[PDB]
Ligand binder design. Structure first.
Ligand SMILES: *C(=O)[C@H](CCSC)NC=O
Ligand SMILES: [Mg+2]
Ligand SMILES: [Mg+2]
Ligand SMILES: [Mg+2]
Ligand SMILES: [Mg+2]
Ligand SMILES: [Mg+2]
Ligand SMILES: [Mg+2]
Ligand SMILES: [Mg+2]
Ligand SMILES: [Mg+2]
Ligand SMILES: [Mg+2]
Ligand SMILES: [Mg+2]
Ligand SMILES: [Mg+2]
Ligand SMILES: [Mg+2]
Ligand SMILES: [Mg+2]
Ligand SMILES: [Mg+2]
Ligand SMILES: [Mg+2]
Ligand SMILES: [Mg+2]
Ligand SMILES: [Mg+2]
Ligand SMILES: [Mg+2]
Ligand SMILES: [Mg+2]
Ligand SMILES: [Mg+2]
Ligand SMILES: [Mg+2]
Ligand SMILES: [Mg+2]
Ligand SMILES: [Mg+2]
Ligand SMILES: [Mg+2]
Ligand SMILES: [Mg+2]
Ligand SMILES: [Mg+2]
Ligand SMILES: [Mg+2]
Ligand SMILES: [Mg+2]
Ligand SMILES: [Mg+2]
Ligand SMILES: [Mg+2]
Ligand SMILES: [Mg+2]
Ligand SMILES: [Mg+2]
Ligand SMILES: [Mg+2]
Ligand SMILES: [Mg+2]
Ligand SMILES: [Mg+2]
Ligand SMILES: [Mg+2]
Ligand SMILES: [Mg+2]
Ligand SMILES: [Mg+2]
Ligand SMILES: [Mg+2]
Ligand SMILES: [Mg+2]
Ligand SMILES: [Mg+2]
Ligand SMILES: [Mg+2]
Ligand SMILES: [Mg+2]
Ligand SMILES: [Mg+2]
Ligand SMILES: [Mg+2]
Ligand SMILES: [Mg+2]
Ligand SMILES: [Mg+2]
Ligand SMILES: [Mg+2]
Ligand SMILES: [Mg+2]
Ligand SMILES: [Mg+2]
Ligand SMILES: [Mg+2]
Ligand SMILES: [Mg+2]
Ligand SMILES: [Mg+2]
Ligand SMILES: [Mg+2]
Ligand SMILES: [Mg+2]
Ligand SMILES: [Mg+2]
Length: 109
RNA sequence: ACAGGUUUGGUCCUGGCCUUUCUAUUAAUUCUUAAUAAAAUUACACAUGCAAGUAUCCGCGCCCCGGUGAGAAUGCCCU
RNA sequence: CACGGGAAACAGCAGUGAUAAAAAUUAAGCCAUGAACGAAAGUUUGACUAAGUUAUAUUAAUUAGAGUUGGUAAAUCUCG
RNA sequence: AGAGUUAAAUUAUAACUAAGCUGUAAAAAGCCCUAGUUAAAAUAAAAUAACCCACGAAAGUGACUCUAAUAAUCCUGACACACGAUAGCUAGGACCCAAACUGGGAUUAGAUACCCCACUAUGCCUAGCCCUAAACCCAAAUAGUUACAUAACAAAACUAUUCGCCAGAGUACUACUCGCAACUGCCUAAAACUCAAAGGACUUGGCGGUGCUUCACAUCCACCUAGAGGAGCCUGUUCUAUAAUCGAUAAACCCCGAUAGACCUUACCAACCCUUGCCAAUUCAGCCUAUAUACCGCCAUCUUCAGCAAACCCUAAAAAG
RNA sequence: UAGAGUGCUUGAUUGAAUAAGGCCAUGAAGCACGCACACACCGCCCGUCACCCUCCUCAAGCAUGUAGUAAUAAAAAUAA
RNA sequence: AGUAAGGUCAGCUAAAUAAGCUAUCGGGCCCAUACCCCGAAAAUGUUGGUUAUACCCUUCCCGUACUACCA
RNA sequence: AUGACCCACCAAUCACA
């Protein structure tokens, strides 16, 4: 079961040069909830879902921070280079909890 | 072995594999009756019954027969 | 090896679990041979004798089915 | 094995002279502190003789001189002993010239090659290792014979005494062991598994960017003439296109089946129609349906190529010639 | 062919140039030589890589099973 | 962000007749593919200005080596 | 420079009574 953790809207897109590699950076503002580094993420464009996966780098003001709270600005670089970050995109951080099912079989007796 | 098939476009040589014979176990398919012979997966575990007594007391018999091939290169033959 | 120790013994005849491709009777007699004991008549003996079971093999007849038919290697026709 | 020596080259290095020298099928790069001549140590390597066939156990040894020297009254014999080409390793010395590597230059689709230039390890000396070669004259040592006698090819066939080896092919000069100055090593040397062959020699073809001869007569080069390939048309292919045939489709198709399509032709497409439906008869006519890889008929092609083939005969065996 | 070609098949007219060489590249013949080819060079064939599968080996380690020698004492006696 | 060279065709390059090598398509060669040999199309980045010329200067884009700095 | 795989020789007549 996928239950939601946090949601953040992108604002500005940056190109940062580290180790001779241009890294697209999504500047984000966390609206409702929080974002955590280990959780799974999905990107949302005007109601569509563009991407599924985990960040490469979540970095906030020259510090790498595992958990950004609400109202916190956070830089986000994905591992997927094919992903395009626009000015108005939405981002949903979700966590997966495990539901343990019992037998669908009930013996008559 | 009285031999035969098979290397190659072909021939010779060399060289393996296989066929043909005979027996035993198992299996498949078939199966009428006798006789004789033989009876065999297992040194894994065993319900029950029987397998050692005789005899005027002592005594004498009681893995001898029977079982098995576990172990051991054990050993054969011979002093 | 067997003082000891694991532990509670069919590798006697039958049987039975397990196991394996592997499947004989939980049978009758001491009448004959052998063995034990007895001075002896005799008793005992799943040794054994006579039977039961089984195409495992031979033989005898009452029994016909299996395999094979391109070559080696006996033997074929029409369909699919 | 020692010690000593050096003729021909080559080079450091000067002296003149010249602007180039080097280098290839052809260039480039390199060098001009280069080249030619005249002078020259060291180092390394040993024309001719050798058309000889000697020495050594083998590996090996062919400039000159001297010293020392080539086991056994001579059968075979190891895993024991002592040696063992090149490469390679360690340490010290040498360095003319050659040269793995590497760097440049060409070449090429690429070229981590062949070709060009530079230069190194290394080739040399001393000392120690290493122990391998197509270490193959693929033919064991020692005595013999030339009798019997052809698988093939090759270097003719064999006896006796020995020793060493070999039991399909791969897997495999591999994996594991033991030993070894070897540590990417040598030696010794399996099995699972896979296959139904793997090998040896020959035969006739075909082929060969193999060599030597001889040619080409519209024929390859050399050469002559007129054209094609560019334009417009004509006509055929291929595609694409259509509801809308088929066949040819390297040489050996492409104004080809057609010396011939407006209807017909005609096989195609679309609508419609007809079911003993060309004929003397026939549970029969009819089919331009499939197969040209079942065929006959006609041909193309090698080809203006010279061979094919029956019947025989010959060959210490014959596939064939 | 009724008609349909710049096509085809035939007849005729005017009417040249060059070749007297070459074996280096192409091709042909003969002879040598080679062949791992024989569907016969449009032949055959080698290794990586890629896709699966089989089997051996080597593995830090882990399970289960597996046992030794050393000197002794023991031949001495009591009571009847 | 600054700096310096720069921008000629899809890629690199020459010059000022707008061209040559690869890429691309199309022909040819070959029994056939590939190499190879030809042919075609392919533009001086958009703004502005001139002149006997644009390879002069500017605007707005651009990129690149170099520095700084970027979540 | 290159050019899937696969291709081949293992059966006997006619005629007469
Ligand atoms: C990064 O540092 C962040 C910038 C994103 S806002 C566009 N601000 C704070 O963490
Ligand atoms: Mg063979
Ligand atoms: Mg054959
Ligand atoms: Mg044989
Ligand atoms: Mg049975
Ligand atoms: Mg016994
Ligand atoms: Mg033993
Ligand atoms: Mg015991
Ligand atoms: Mg029993
Ligand atoms: Mg007992
Ligand atoms: Mg049972
Ligand atoms: Mg049985
Ligand atoms: Mg039964
Ligand atoms: Mg009795
Ligand atoms: Mg009695
Ligand atoms: Mg009884
Ligand atoms: Mg010197
Ligand atoms: Mg030069
Ligand atoms: Mg000399
Ligand atoms: Mg001597
Ligand atoms: Mg000797
Ligand atoms: Mg040596
Ligand atoms: Mg050396
Ligand atoms: Mg040295
Ligand atoms: Mg040197
Ligand atoms: Mg040199
Ligand atoms: Mg080079
Ligand atoms: Mg010396
Ligand atoms: Mg030699
Ligand atoms: Mg040898
Ligand atoms: Mg010898
Ligand atoms: Mg043999
Ligand atoms: Mg083997
Ligand atoms: Mg070797
Ligand atoms: Mg080895
Ligand atoms: Mg071993
Ligand atoms: Mg001509
Ligand atoms: Mg004309
Ligand atoms: Mg023309
Ligand atoms: Mg034309
Ligand atoms: Mg057509
Ligand atoms: Mg047809
Ligand atoms: Mg056709
Ligand atoms: Mg043809
Ligand atoms: Mg018509
Ligand atoms: Mg009509
Ligand atoms: Mg029809
Ligand atoms: Mg034909
Ligand atoms: Mg003739
Ligand atoms: Mg002959
Ligand atoms: Mg003949
Ligand atoms: Mg006409
Ligand atoms: Mg040869
Ligand atoms: Mg052959
Ligand atoms: Mg070839
Ligand atoms: Mg290829
Ligand atoms: Mg082929």
């Amino acid at each position: 079961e996928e239950h939601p953790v946090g949601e953040a809207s992108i604002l500005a897109t940056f190109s940062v040069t580290e180790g001779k590699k241009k890294v697209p950076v999504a500047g984000c503002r966390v609206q409702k909830g929080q974002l955590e580094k280990q959780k799974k993420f999905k990107l949302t464009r005007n109601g569509h879902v563009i991407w599924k996966g985990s960040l490469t780098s979540l970095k906030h003001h020259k510090d790498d921070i595992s958990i950004v709270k609400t109202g916190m600005d956070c830089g986000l670089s994905l591992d997927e280079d094919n992903m395009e970050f626009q000015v108005g995109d939405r981002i949903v951080c979700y966590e997966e909890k495990q539901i343990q099912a019992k037998t669908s079989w009930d013996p008559g007796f």
